[PDB]
RNA sequence: CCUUCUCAAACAUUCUGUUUGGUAGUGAGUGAUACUCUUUGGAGUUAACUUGAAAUUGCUGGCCUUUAGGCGAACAAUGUUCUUAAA
């Protein structure tokens, strides 16, 4: 997670930099074959103001020059409303693995018609829209580990959760 | 206003005064001093309670810089024209660009100097004073004008020719050569410099008697004096040669009542 | 010596790379043609060839001369203090010909003459000359006449 | 013989007695330090005087500074002889202006104006070339 | 055995810097008391250095905003006065490489003319601000059992809501969000995320990095301009490319 | 033996700057930076005129 | 061993005009004609010249603040305390 880490004085970078540069060049050419094999341009363009919103995979636009069921295009046509409270990054990437949309108010204050679902982890929810579904994020962590839909009564705040043990 | 007749009386008196006569080959500077007109203005509180190195350019009917130049060709010191411009300004402006505009009305810029050149080439008091003393007419961009006095030296701010003159190449966002072109014409032939010292004493330099017509002297003096009266509350006016004693022409006795 | 080096690093000569680079610039200009103008004031630099340094004396042209103390054929050098003495040239004996070669893009130089100076630097030149003539010509002139060394080790 | 009192000429701009103290203390402790300043504006006249606790320390300091190039122009230091004492220096500030009221009322000095104008007319008679006004 | 040159050059540098802060204080007292008849420019200006380097000038905004100031190493050999030291000490900018978040208003603005030769100013991006806060940041903290001069990096959101449950500030993502917002509380984040540290950008000594130092000193001499006019435009640089270096 | 294009263009600049007179073009700084000899100027201009422009 | 305020507004369109504001000095020496007060204490102004930033003691303005700062800014004010220009 994107947290400031206390640096260890015990380690020496002089090895991990060599591993870094080796893996960097290796993964670089592997990204070349995966981008050309997927048929699109190997340098990925990004809008600069989209990067100014968020420095993520969603900054890059991916050009041109089905999905395997069910996990790809799971939650198809599905509009999320991730909060400012949630960790935006890995949930953003999971929704992108779903193909659904991401709407975070944290992105909004840089500067809501189709939103049906709030991923949020808060005790007290303010506007409490009955149309909008209130869900603690483990639902996304459990639905993709099953590949399938589960009921969200456990994921409704502030209901307790099943102790998740992943498929390993 | 001011009785023009009295001014003609005084200037004819001064012509008669300067008409009064092992010698030098090359003539005395003092002999050149005793031929020249200076206007002296007594006025209440001519301070701004602060030093004013800025020169006021008074609109004058006649232009003494051309008889200056015509006698300066005969004279030892040669009349020269200095402009001080920005670095980008000198990068854009060329010399034939100036000379073509100035031969239209028949004048000439001697030199153009960047503030860089002032701060490295003449960053030495001897060379700087020698370089300044060559010049009579010194112009500078109004932006540079308020940056000058560390670079110019106070010896330049002592005299009237040596202190620079505010002039503007800009009228819009950027400068135009048209603005500098007619602006050097305005400052050259339609305006005369004014030092603004402290105290109640103002000294205004007019020039040698041999340069202009005496009634033209009178016209320029009365125009300037009306400009001063409309400008400032004035105690008195004494015009004279710096060798000669004063000449009382005009004074307002109620200004001193109005001071306090 | 520190201010003398600050002076002469203002007047470094052009390197072969910088020379060839400017040559390629002006040659590509003429190759387009695009003959921009015909104007350049002069190159000013230090002068460093030994026969060239002696050559700049006996005109005289040398405004300052630096002389390295250590040369293995010393006899190449020994006339130069007396020669600048009689020619009145403001010589100064510098310490180390490698430091001369650094300011002139050589390994060593052993001599350093300087003639032409811009107007920005000319006033610094004269006070440096007066500084050296105070510090060198006044201090060491009589002890120059004395037989040095002779004390055993 | 020479004293510990010291004359220093050719000082650079903005280089003052505080800096003189802070520098020459490293030679050894100094007795007194003064700069010749101008009266209307407290600017350096580029020469000053030092005094040390010792004459020998004064000579040591004078040796390493006599032909010392510094911030443009070089400096020159000379110790004084044994018959020499410090006299009459002061840190002058910039003396600002003062404005004091005219003592005489306005009609007394109107009369003074009227008298001085006629008097200057009498001088134009006395010099004298004609001037009817 | 200190030097004879630096003692005089610093004295001239003190004369220059103290006099320009004097002229700043004069002209700002004239603007503030509105006894204005004799000044150069009535309103202030904001200069924008971006990429032979363009500088865009926009008139001042009467609106509060977010800035991320960057304490630069100051100019060459200057002893800095007490008026600038007071402003820097109220802004915690001693021990350089500390860029800190600040508020643009009209009353905080006259400080920006004074600190400008020692800091750099600009508009940062919320992705860059995000990466600053999620990678760097210390919290002076009162904990379990300490002598308690201790600072923790941003890990516990419950530590955050512990001291900031009154303002209702939880989950440091929201601290990023409401440093961006400044609608409810921004100076509370100045109390809480009070310390800041940046890295030194060049490895420094040694041949391969001395060339980098020389090139970046040329870059800094281009980007920083020193005005000393007391009508000094505020100079903004893109912090977004700048935090590709310093974070 | 003809002339080179740059230097005949240089002569062409001199021919329009001064005309035909040689004492003015001899003391010209711009476009006579090699300070050519008084009559070498004449020789090159006469060769240029016989080549081009009468 | 540093580098110096390198523009502001208003009106107007004339292919750029018009008005206003924005500038503390290098020290020393020579010196013309004067001006103004101050209450004799002189003070503040006025031509012109010299000089490698030259160099030898011109005895203690006033007012106000704090324990040095402003008079070119009055609830005005100021310090010499920036480290990868190290070692």
UniProtKB/Swiss-Prot annotation, chain C:
Q: Subcellular localization, per the record? A: Cytoplasm
Q: Which UniProt keywords apply?
A: Cytoplasm, Ribonucleoprotein, Ribosomal protein
Going by the entry's taxonomy, the superkingdom of the source organism is recorded as: Eukaryota
Gene Ontology CC:
cytosol; cytosolic large ribosomal subunit
- Principal localization? cytoplasm
Is Ribosomal protein tagged as a keyword? yes
An annotated GO BP: maturation of LSU-rRNA
Molecular function GO labels: RNA binding; structural constituent of ribosome
Its UniProt miscellaneous note says:
Present with 238000 molecules/cell in log phase SD medium. There are 2 genes for eL8 in yeast.
Question: What does the annotation say about its assembly with partners?
Answer: Component of the large ribosomal subunit (LSU). Mature yeast ribosomes consist of a small (40S) and a large (60S) subunit. The 40S small subunit contains 1 molecule of ribosomal RNA (18S rRNA) and 33 different proteins (encoded by 57 genes). The large 60S subunit contains 3 rRNA molecules (25S, 5.8S and 5S rRNA) and 46 different proteins (encoded by 81 genes).
Tell me its family: Belongs to the eukaryotic ribosomal protein eL8 family.
What exactly does this protein do? Component of the ribosome, a large ribonucleoprotein complex responsible for the synthesis of proteins in the cell. The small ribosomal subunit (SSU) binds messenger RNAs (mRNAs) and translates the encoded message by selecting cognate aminoacyl-transfer RNA (tRNA) molecules. The large subunit (LSU) contains the ribosomal catalytic site termed the peptidyl transferase center (PTC), which catalyzes the formation of peptide bonds, thereby polymerizing the amino acids delivered by tRNAs into a polypeptide chain.
Protein name from the UniProt record? Large ribosomal subunit protein eL8A
From Swiss-Prot, chain D:
Q: Does the keyword 4Fe-4S apply?
A: no
RRM domain ranges (all copies): 4-82
Biological process annotations from GO: maturation of LSU-rRNA from tricistronic rRNA transcript (SSU-rRNA, 5.8S rRNA, LSU-rRNA); ribosomal large subunit biogenesis; rRNA processing
Indicate the principal place this protein occupies in or around the cell: cytoplasm
Q: Name one GO molecular function term.
A: RNA binding
Keyword check for rRNA processing: yes
Mind listing the UniProt keywords for this protein, alphabetically?
Cytoplasm, Nucleus, Ribonucleoprotein, Ribosome biogenesis, RNA-binding, rRNA processing
How is this protein named in the record?
A: Ribosome biogenesis protein 15
User: Lineage, please?
Assistant: Eukaryota, Fungi, Dikarya, Ascomycota, Saccharomycotina
Swiss-Prot record, chain E:
Q: Which residues carry this modification: Phosphoserine?
A: 203
Keywords of the record: Acetylation, Nucleus, Phosphoprotein, Ribosome biogenesis, RNA-binding
Any GO MF annotation of the entry: structural constituent of ribosome
Any one of the GO BP annotations: maturation of LSU-rRNA from tricistronic rRNA transcript (SSU-rRNA, 5.8S rRNA, LSU-rRNA)
Instruction: Please tell me where this protein is predominantly located.
Output: nucleus
Q: Which top-rank group of organisms is this from? A: Eukaryota
Native species: Saccharomyces cerevisiae (strain ATCC 204508 / S288c)
Cite a GO CC annotation.
Answer: cytosolic large ribosomal subunit
- Miscellaneous information on this protein: Present with 7720 molecules/cell in log phase SD medium.
- Name of this protein: Ribosome biogenesis protein RLP7
From Swiss-Prot, chain F:
| Annotated compartments | Nucleus, Nucleolus
- Superkingdom of the source? Eukaryota
At which residues is Phosphoserine found? 2, 4
Family recorded in the similarity comment: Belongs to the NOP16 family.
The misc remark on file is: Present with 2860 molecules/cell in log phase SD medium.
What does it do? Involved in the biogenesis of the 60S ribosomal subunit.
Q: Assembly and interactions?
A: Component of the pre-66S ribosomal particle. Interacts with NOP7, RRP1 and RRP15.
| Protein's recorded name | Nucleolar protein 16
Q: Gene for this protein?
A: NOP16
**Whole protein: which stretch is covered?**
175 to 228 of 231
